[PDB]
Amino acid sequence: LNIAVMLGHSHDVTERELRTLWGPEQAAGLPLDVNVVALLMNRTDPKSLITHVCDLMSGARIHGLVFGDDTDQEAVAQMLDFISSHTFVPILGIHGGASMIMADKDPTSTFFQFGASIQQQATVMLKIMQDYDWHVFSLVTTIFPGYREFISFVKTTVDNSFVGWDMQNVITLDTSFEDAKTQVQLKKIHSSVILLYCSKDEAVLILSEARSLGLTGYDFFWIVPSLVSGNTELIPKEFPSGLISVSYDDWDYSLEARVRDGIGILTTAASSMLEKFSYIPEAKASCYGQMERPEVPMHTLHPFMVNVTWDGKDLSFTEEGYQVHPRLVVIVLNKDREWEKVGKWENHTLSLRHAVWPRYKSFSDC
Amino acid sequence: LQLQESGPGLVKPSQTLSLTCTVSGGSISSSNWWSWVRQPPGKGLEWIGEIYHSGNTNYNPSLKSRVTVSVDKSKNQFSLKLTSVTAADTAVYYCARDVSGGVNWFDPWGQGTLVTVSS
Amino acid sequence: KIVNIGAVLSTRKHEQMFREAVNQANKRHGSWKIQLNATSVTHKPNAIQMALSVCEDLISSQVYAILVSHPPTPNDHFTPTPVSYTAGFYRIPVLGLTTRMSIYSDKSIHLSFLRTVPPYSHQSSVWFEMMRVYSWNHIILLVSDDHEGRAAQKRLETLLEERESKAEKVLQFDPGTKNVTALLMEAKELEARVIILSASEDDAATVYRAAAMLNMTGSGYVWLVGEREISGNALRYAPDGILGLQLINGKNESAHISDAVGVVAQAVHELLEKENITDPPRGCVGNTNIWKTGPLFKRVLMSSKYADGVTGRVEFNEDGDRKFANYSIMNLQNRKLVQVGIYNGTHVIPNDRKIIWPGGETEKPRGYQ
Amino acid sequence: NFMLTQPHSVSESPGKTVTISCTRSSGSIASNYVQWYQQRPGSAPTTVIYEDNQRPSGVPDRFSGSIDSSSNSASLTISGLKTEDEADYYCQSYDSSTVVFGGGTKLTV
């Protein structure tokens, strides 16, 4: 009935008036019409986000909003999750900083994100592996939090497959840049597939150490998750030419389409809720004013964001709290220091573009 | 099952007092607890301590370090060994059996003996 | 130069102690550049207003570390969350004092958080040591569907798989349920007898009430639980001989305050001797950046092993928790708790008190069909 | 440890009902049971109420109890008073550390 959108005018400088133009105004058909309360937040601060959200709640009567900011800070998603948990309004995470998949949400949270968990990245990596006839690898996970879940999922999938997986020895570089056990541990690797997992600087250091050791040539196909590729504009000088890495869609997905999809799913959920019952829910009185402690309303919007389809493509959400049919892409560091697409992540099967691996050269000297 | 009480009357001031309560009609080797409770004349009821049949005891924190309870199932009798008595300890002493239960419940209480401390 | 640490305490009297602590901190070794100041606030019944005030005091004082604590009003689940979320934006270290839930242990969500007491899902080592000393190899796990139960199950499964042995069964029951008899009846017809419970007190009462009806808590069984199931209202239906664990300083706060003050002072003394540092951000509303020496401060705090305090050594591990914490193993006889064992941190040792196993008698029950 | 407080003596006439309570001072009577004990002078006290609503098969149906958990009190509703009820009543409850009794009560006809 009344929803709001906001963004940090990163790519909206040329689309300042398009935010009001976009949205359902002349190209939609639905129950009682909804209007968009636009807003342009200059920057995100702990005292700024709270004040803006509370002002919108107590001065606009909103029951759902989409949020996207270009800030590289990660705590924005967690702060927004806390706000949604203590405000009882559903919020989205369409683009930007509020798009990293949080591990575990609050028990009574109402946060829905547009991203991809580590599990889907691991499974698309294994799909690539089984598609390109590579059947022996070696995991490398140094210190980064959540690595235990990644290792456990990799082991579980290896043990539960009909392709004869030959997972070789794995290592854990707890003491990064120590020159005590890292050298012998890396020397212990005898295979040609490597599954890196680390931060940006840790990956750079490990790649430099591998360069020094010499296990990098025409028969060493590295694979690295979306973590080491967060911004495809800061390519270091130690990334070997030819390196697989999956990431979210940027090359073909626009802000307008994302905003339209979010508005569509929210409106469809509201329509389904209004069809199921006759008592629409109203917004809360105020955020900071909490003299009386309220409770959850009657059948809040939760079993209405799963069986959702809007104009073709399915937009379902799982009970865990993330998407079900993402738009993952597979890219490789082409030998021009510029990433290039190789294949989408379609309905369930991977549709590659290259029939065979072109054997990309290493860093010239090799 | 019935309980019998027997105490050696009055005692000299600042001495050691030993009561003997005997059980007739039942076996000490069971799954119950046996305890002592005392009541001063015209006052409240204060719990003293419980002793399991086999090995271990429990005492009131206020008077924990003045009681050494004991049992003997070879003759089916448990005894109280109050030590370092004071002048304000004259009271009626009871021996009561409490079931294992899951609750603390005293049944059945003994006849009781009168104990006076003086010279 | 001066550096100042902030505190969020729930008692004015504690402020009297806390101040004394820093007064004792800048008395042993100071007099140059280490003039410590103390800034304290109070807990608020509302949760939203906590963050506004927390970065208001951050802005006014540009503190280096924040010492949080738990209030007496028992929810203990979201009380330090607003402070950890807001202070995590600027990566200023925040160390708790009386927090036990295992959600805060995940370093992925709460980027900068340290703890003084071991978490709830950290006593499985005590159960493993008890199993080793008493020689019980066949066990039955029974947990609830939540973060704490899953974490405890994962830790115990890893610990047992270290010996290449698995649990006989792993039951998972819905938290806050009302009918349990089906699952417990299913678990009744098995081989193992040792039953390990780990859940909340409110449902622990229901579990005990359901179990007591099926004549399964009689003689010949063995019960082991955690700490939550012993305390609270769940002691009405607890059967005899239920072994439990207790922390030795789980409620004292002055000792924890002195511990935190000492370790923070040592960390700041060790850190200020190195150049290339940057002051905290000036305002909560000023700008959105990241502290330059945040991770460096966190690392130097992790590496700091305190020599000796009122609560022993304070050596952390590479997780944000505390290591080598004593435990007391308590058995309750006739609705009365009596300590019977003590766990140093490596191996448990018993006392001179013959325990009473469930259903009476005194033996060393083994458990098998 | 804690203390139990109960009023001393209550006046009533035969043929009606009276109620007395030993309100818990420290804590709350919700995690422990309460028991009510009869006592005739020059005799061993006997159980009259246990688990707040049981009754041993030796007492006539004239006693009942309840817990309100508002003022932390327990009731001893007695109906149909007779001349064989002039005695002293006690109330007892346990905890995790010790066992404590109450005060006294001199019911009169």
* Cα gap A20→A35, rounded to integer Å: 9
* Cα gap A280→A282, rounded to integer Å: 7
* Cα gap B73→B75, rounded to integer Å: 5
CA end-to-end span of chain B, whole Å?
A: 37
As given in the structure block, the two tokens for residue D108 are 């009169």
Peptide bond into B108 cis (omega under 30): yes
Q: Which chains touch A (3 or more CB pairs under 8 A)?
A: C
Q: B20 CB contacts (<8 Å, ≥6 apart)? A: B6, B7, B77, B79
Domain that holds residue D95: 1-109
A11 labelled binding-site residue: yes
H/E run at residue D91: strand D88-94
* Cα gap A141→C211, rounded to integer Å: 45
* Cα gap B15→B82, rounded to integer Å: 9
Give the CATH number, domain containing residue D82: 2.60.40.10
Closest CA to A345 of A223, A229, A232, A252: A252
Interchain proximity D31–C335, CB inside 8 Å: no
Give the method used: cryo-EM
Q: Which of D30, D33, D94 sits opposite C233 (nearest CB)?
A: D30
Question: What residue type is B102 in one-letter code?
Answer: G
Closest CA to A116 of A355, A335, A261, A320: A320
Per the CB < 8 A criterion, the answer to whether A128 and A245 are in contact is: no
Using alpha carbons only, how large is chain B's radius of gyration in Å?
14
Residues in D touching B107 (Cβ below 8 Å): 46-47
Residues in C touching A101 (Cβ below 8 Å): none
Residue B93: φ, ψ to 5°: -110, 135
Residues in D touching B110 (Cβ below 8 Å): 44
**What Å resolution does this PDB entry report?**
3.8
Our CA-based measurement puts residue B118 at a distance from the nearest CA of chain D, in whole angstroms, of: 23
Helix (H, G, I), strand (E, B) or coil at A244: strand
Interchain proximity C239–B102, CB inside 8 Å: yes
As given in the structure block, the two tokens for residue B37 are 């409770």
Q: How far is CA D54 from the centre of its chain?
A: 13
Our CA-based measurement puts residue B36 at a distance from the nearest CA of chain D, in whole angstroms, of: 12
Residue C196: φ, ψ to 5°: -115, 125
Interchain proximity C233–D97, CB inside 8 Å: no
As given in the structure block, the two tokens for residue B86 are 């004071």
Nearest CA in chain C to B60: C336
Where do we find the tokens 């202070």? C87
Closest CA to A277 of A307, A295, A306, A297: A297
C94-95 and C66-68: which strand pairing? parallel
As given in the structure block, the two tokens for residue A284 are 């809360």
Per the CB < 8 A criterion, the answer to whether D88 and D105 are in contact is: yes
D46-49 and D34-39: which strand pairing? antiparallel
Domain locations in chain B as residue ranges: 2-112
As given in the structure block, the two tokens for residue A7 are 């963004």
Which neighbouring-strand residues pair with A341? A331
Helix (H, G, I), strand (E, B) or coil at D11: strand
Question: What residue type is A247 in one-letter code?
Answer: S
Q: D58 CB contacts (<8 Å, ≥6 apart)? A: none
Domain B2-112, CATH among 3.40.50.300, 3.40.50.2020, 1.20.1440.130, 2.60.40.10: 2.60.40.10
Residue B84's CB: how many other CB atoms inside 10 A?
9
Q: How far is CA C76 from the centre of its chain?
A: 11
Residues in B touching C240 (Cβ below 8 Å): 100, 102
Which neighbouring-strand residues pair with D4? D24
Using alpha carbons only, how large is chain C's radius of gyration in Å?
23
Residues in D touching C233 (Cβ below 8 Å): 30-31
| Angle of CA points B53, B55, B60, to nearest 5° | 85
Closest CA to D30 of D65, D74, D84, D60: D74
H/E run at residue D100: strand D99-100
Question: Which residues of C lie closer than 8 Å to D, measured between beta carbons?
Answer: 232-233, 235-236, 332, 335-337
Residues in C touching B100 (Cβ below 8 Å): 240, 334, 360
Per the CB < 8 A criterion, the answer to whether C116 and C256 are in contact is: yes
Per the CB < 8 A criterion, the answer to whether C334 and B100 are in contact is: yes
Please name each of the domains of chain C with its CATH number.
4-118+252-302 (3.40.50.2300), 123-248+325-350 (3.40.50.2300)
Whether C147 contacts chain A with CB within 8 A: yes
H/E run at residue C328: strand C327-332
Where do we find the tokens 């001066």? C2
* Cα gap C284→A55, rounded to integer Å: 18
Q: CATH 3.40.50.2300: which residues of chain A?
A: 2-115+251-276, 118-247+328-352
A131 labelled binding-site residue: no
Residue A280's CB: how many other CB atoms inside 10 A?
11
* Cα gap A97→A81, rounded to integer Å: 13
Closest CA to A3 of A32, A35, A33, A30: A35
Q: Residue B29 carries which DSSP code?
A: S
Per the CB < 8 A criterion, the answer to whether A1 and A63 are in contact is: yes
Per the CB < 8 A criterion, the answer to whether C256 and C275 are in contact is: no
Question: What residue type is A190 in one-letter code?
Answer: H
Interchain proximity D44–B107, CB inside 8 Å: no
The full DSSP string for A122-162 is: HHHHHHHHHHTT-----EEE-S-TTHHHHHHHHHHHHHT-S
What is the total count of domains within chain D?
1
Q: Residue C141 carries which DSSP code?
A: E
Which neighbouring-strand residues pair with B33? B52, B98
Closest CA to A96 of A80, A118, A119: A80
Which neighbouring-strand residues pair with C235? none
Which neighbouring-strand residues pair with D59? none
Helix (H, G, I), strand (E, B) or coil at D37: strand
* Cα gap D85→A331, rounded to integer Å: 93
Interface probe, candidates A81, A82, A118, A200, chain C, greatest C C-beta count within 10 A: A82
Alpha carbon separation from A64 to A116, C23, C272 (Å, rounded): 22, 50, 47
Question: Do the chains C and A touch each other, judged by at least 3 C-beta pairs below 8 angstroms?
Answer: yes
- CATH code of domain A118-247+328-352: 3.40.50.2300
Q: Residue A307 carries which DSSP code?
A: S
Interchain proximity B100–C360, CB inside 8 Å: yes
- CATH code of domain A2-115+251-276: 3.40.50.2300
Question: Do the chains D and B touch each other, judged by at least 3 C-beta pairs below 8 angstroms?
Answer: yes
